[PDB]
Amino acid sequence: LDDSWVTVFGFPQASASYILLQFAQYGNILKHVMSNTGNWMHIRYQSKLQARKALSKDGRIFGESIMIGVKPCIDKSVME
Amino acid sequence: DHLDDSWVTVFGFPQASASYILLQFAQYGNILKHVMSNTGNWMHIRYQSKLQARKALSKDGRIFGESIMIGVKPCIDKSVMESS
């Protein structure tokens, strides 16, 4: 079930709710965890397919100014 | 068009940390050219070799200074690469 989790990164804190709303277009978000210090968040999708759609956005530019990273989530503490 | 393999795009850093990230990526090889985007949070780095670019690529998703998770991908901007 870790395959439905992704880590979205490379955004400033002021852009966090824009990036989250943008990633809500690729599927239903069951849970999202914002990093206290860092420029990343953990998103849990409803299905592995929705997470794959989010993963395909890795290296893409949002609003012509934010290049976003998307990788499989490896934070065992957040997922468990 | 094969020489594009020594180019990488480093991204995801706040504007204040641009010099820090470039100097950090200078440790993975000799930087022949670097282009800091003047429209977004990324930079195009050209290494001396394909191997140095591969070392930089392996740093994709890694955390610098405990607060900046950096993205590293092959450079796809042909206007930036062909100009060199």
Side-chain angles (χ1 to χ4, degrees), chain B residues 53-54 56-65 67-77:
Chain B
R54 282 193 101 81
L57 284 159
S58 74
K59 297 300 168 219
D60 175 70
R62 300 278 291 276
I63 303 157
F64 295 78
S67 62
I68 310 151
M69 193 177 290
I70 285 288
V72 197
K73 61 169 201 179
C75 182
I76 63 152
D77 195 322

Short mmCIF file of all heavy atoms in Angstrom, two decimals, chain B residues 53-77, unseen atoms left out:
data_model
loop_
_atom_site.label_atom_id
_atom_site.label_comp_id
_atom_site.label_asym_id
_atom_site.label_seq_id
_atom_site.Cartn_x
_atom_site.Cartn_y
_atom_site.Cartn_z
N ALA B 53 27.91 14.08 -14.81
CA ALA B 53 26.48 14.37 -14.90
C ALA B 53 25.69 13.24 -14.22
O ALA B 53 24.71 13.54 -13.53
CB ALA B 53 26.05 14.54 -16.34
N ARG B 54 26.14 11.97 -14.37
CA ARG B 54 25.51 10.80 -13.74
C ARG B 54 25.61 10.88 -12.21
O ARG B 54 24.64 10.56 -11.51
CB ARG B 54 26.11 9.48 -14.26
CG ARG B 54 25.58 9.10 -15.65
CD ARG B 54 25.91 7.68 -16.07
NE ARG B 54 24.77 6.76 -15.89
CZ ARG B 54 23.75 6.64 -16.75
NH1 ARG B 54 23.71 7.38 -17.85
NH2 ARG B 54 22.77 5.78 -16.50
N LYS B 55 26.76 11.36 -11.68
CA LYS B 55 26.99 11.56 -10.25
C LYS B 55 25.98 12.61 -9.74
O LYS B 55 25.30 12.36 -8.75
CB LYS B 55 28.45 11.97 -9.95
CG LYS B 55 28.79 12.13 -8.46
N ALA B 56 25.83 13.74 -10.48
CA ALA B 56 24.86 14.78 -10.15
C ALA B 56 23.42 14.23 -10.20
O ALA B 56 22.64 14.52 -9.29
CB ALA B 56 25.00 15.96 -11.10
N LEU B 57 23.10 13.39 -11.20
CA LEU B 57 21.77 12.79 -11.38
C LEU B 57 21.38 11.88 -10.21
O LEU B 57 20.20 11.86 -9.84
CB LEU B 57 21.67 12.01 -12.69
CG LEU B 57 21.53 12.87 -13.95
CD1 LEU B 57 21.93 12.10 -15.18
CD2 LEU B 57 20.14 13.41 -14.09
N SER B 58 22.35 11.20 -9.59
CA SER B 58 22.14 10.30 -8.45
C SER B 58 21.74 11.09 -7.17
O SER B 58 21.35 10.48 -6.18
CB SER B 58 23.40 9.48 -8.19
OG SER B 58 24.43 10.25 -7.60
N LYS B 59 21.84 12.43 -7.21
CA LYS B 59 21.53 13.31 -6.08
C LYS B 59 20.07 13.76 -6.11
O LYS B 59 19.63 14.47 -5.20
CB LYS B 59 22.49 14.51 -6.04
CG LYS B 59 23.97 14.13 -5.82
CD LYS B 59 24.22 13.38 -4.51
CE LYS B 59 25.60 12.76 -4.45
NZ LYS B 59 25.57 11.41 -3.81
N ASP B 60 19.31 13.30 -7.14
CA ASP B 60 17.89 13.61 -7.29
C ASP B 60 17.11 13.04 -6.09
O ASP B 60 17.28 11.87 -5.74
CB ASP B 60 17.34 13.06 -8.62
CG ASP B 60 15.84 13.25 -8.74
OD1 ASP B 60 15.40 14.41 -8.89
OD2 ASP B 60 15.10 12.26 -8.59
N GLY B 61 16.30 13.90 -5.46
CA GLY B 61 15.51 13.56 -4.28
C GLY B 61 16.27 13.63 -2.96
O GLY B 61 15.69 13.33 -1.91
N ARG B 62 17.58 14.02 -2.99
CA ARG B 62 18.38 14.14 -1.78
C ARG B 62 18.17 15.51 -1.11
O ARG B 62 17.79 16.47 -1.79
CB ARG B 62 19.87 13.86 -2.04
CG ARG B 62 20.17 12.45 -2.61
CD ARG B 62 20.24 11.34 -1.57
NE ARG B 62 21.41 11.46 -0.69
CZ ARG B 62 22.63 11.01 -0.99
NH1 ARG B 62 22.86 10.40 -2.15
NH2 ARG B 62 23.63 11.18 -0.13
N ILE B 63 18.40 15.58 0.22
CA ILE B 63 18.20 16.77 1.05
C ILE B 63 19.53 17.45 1.37
O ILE B 63 20.45 16.82 1.90
CB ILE B 63 17.38 16.44 2.33
CG1 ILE B 63 16.02 15.81 1.97
CG2 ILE B 63 17.17 17.70 3.17
CD1 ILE B 63 15.40 14.98 3.04
N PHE B 64 19.61 18.75 1.03
CA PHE B 64 20.79 19.60 1.25
C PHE B 64 20.46 20.59 2.36
O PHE B 64 19.38 21.20 2.35
CB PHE B 64 21.21 20.31 -0.05
CG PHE B 64 21.68 19.38 -1.15
CD1 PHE B 64 20.77 18.68 -1.93
CD2 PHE B 64 23.04 19.19 -1.39
CE1 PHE B 64 21.20 17.81 -2.94
CE2 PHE B 64 23.47 18.34 -2.42
CZ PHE B 64 22.55 17.66 -3.19
N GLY B 65 21.33 20.68 3.36
CA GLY B 65 21.18 21.58 4.50
C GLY B 65 19.99 21.28 5.39
O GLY B 65 19.52 22.18 6.09
N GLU B 66 19.49 20.01 5.35
CA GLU B 66 18.33 19.50 6.09
C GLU B 66 16.99 20.18 5.69
O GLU B 66 15.94 19.83 6.25
CB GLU B 66 18.54 19.61 7.62
N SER B 67 16.99 21.11 4.72
CA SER B 67 15.75 21.82 4.37
C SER B 67 15.45 21.88 2.87
O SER B 67 14.34 22.25 2.50
CB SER B 67 15.81 23.25 4.90
OG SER B 67 16.89 23.95 4.29
N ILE B 68 16.44 21.59 2.00
CA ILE B 68 16.21 21.69 0.57
C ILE B 68 16.35 20.32 -0.09
O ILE B 68 17.45 19.82 -0.27
CB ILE B 68 17.12 22.75 -0.14
CG1 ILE B 68 17.10 24.13 0.56
CG2 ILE B 68 16.75 22.89 -1.62
CD1 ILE B 68 18.46 24.96 0.37
N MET B 69 15.21 19.74 -0.46
CA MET B 69 15.18 18.53 -1.27
C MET B 69 15.34 19.04 -2.71
O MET B 69 14.59 19.92 -3.14
CB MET B 69 13.89 17.72 -1.07
CG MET B 69 13.98 16.33 -1.67
SD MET B 69 12.43 15.27 -1.37
CE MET B 69 12.64 15.00 0.47
N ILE B 70 16.39 18.57 -3.38
CA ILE B 70 16.78 18.99 -4.71
C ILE B 70 16.40 17.93 -5.74
O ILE B 70 16.51 16.72 -5.49
CB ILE B 70 18.33 19.28 -4.70
CG1 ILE B 70 18.68 20.62 -3.99
CG2 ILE B 70 18.97 19.20 -6.09
CD1 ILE B 70 18.31 21.93 -4.75
N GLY B 71 15.93 18.41 -6.87
CA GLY B 71 15.61 17.60 -8.02
C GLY B 71 16.75 17.70 -9.01
O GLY B 71 17.37 18.77 -9.14
N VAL B 72 17.06 16.58 -9.69
CA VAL B 72 18.11 16.50 -10.71
C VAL B 72 17.60 15.64 -11.86
O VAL B 72 17.30 14.45 -11.67
CB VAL B 72 19.52 16.00 -10.24
CG1 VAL B 72 20.59 16.37 -11.28
CG2 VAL B 72 19.89 16.56 -8.88
N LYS B 73 17.54 16.23 -13.04
CA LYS B 73 17.04 15.52 -14.22
C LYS B 73 17.92 15.82 -15.44
O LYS B 73 18.59 16.87 -15.47
CB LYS B 73 15.57 15.93 -14.51
CG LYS B 73 15.38 17.42 -14.81
CD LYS B 73 14.01 17.72 -15.35
CE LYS B 73 14.00 19.03 -16.10
NZ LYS B 73 12.67 19.33 -16.66
N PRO B 74 17.92 14.95 -16.49
CA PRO B 74 18.65 15.31 -17.72
C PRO B 74 18.08 16.63 -18.29
O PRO B 74 16.86 16.86 -18.24
CB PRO B 74 18.38 14.12 -18.65
CG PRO B 74 18.00 13.00 -17.73
CD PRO B 74 17.21 13.66 -16.65
N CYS B 75 18.95 17.52 -18.75
CA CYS B 75 18.55 18.80 -19.33
C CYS B 75 17.86 18.54 -20.68
O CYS B 75 18.32 17.72 -21.47
CB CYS B 75 19.77 19.73 -19.48
SG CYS B 75 19.39 21.37 -20.13
N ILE B 76 16.72 19.22 -20.91
CA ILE B 76 15.92 19.04 -22.13
C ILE B 76 15.83 20.36 -22.93
O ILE B 76 15.27 20.38 -24.02
CB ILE B 76 14.51 18.45 -21.80
CG1 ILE B 76 13.67 19.42 -20.91
CG2 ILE B 76 14.61 17.04 -21.19
CD1 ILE B 76 12.14 19.28 -21.09
N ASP B 77 16.38 21.46 -22.38
CA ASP B 77 16.36 22.78 -23.03
C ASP B 77 17.45 22.83 -24.11
O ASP B 77 18.61 23.14 -23.82
CB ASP B 77 16.52 23.91 -22.00
CG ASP B 77 16.15 25.29 -22.53
OD1 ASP B 77 16.44 25.58 -23.71
OD2 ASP B 77 15.67 26.11 -21.73
#
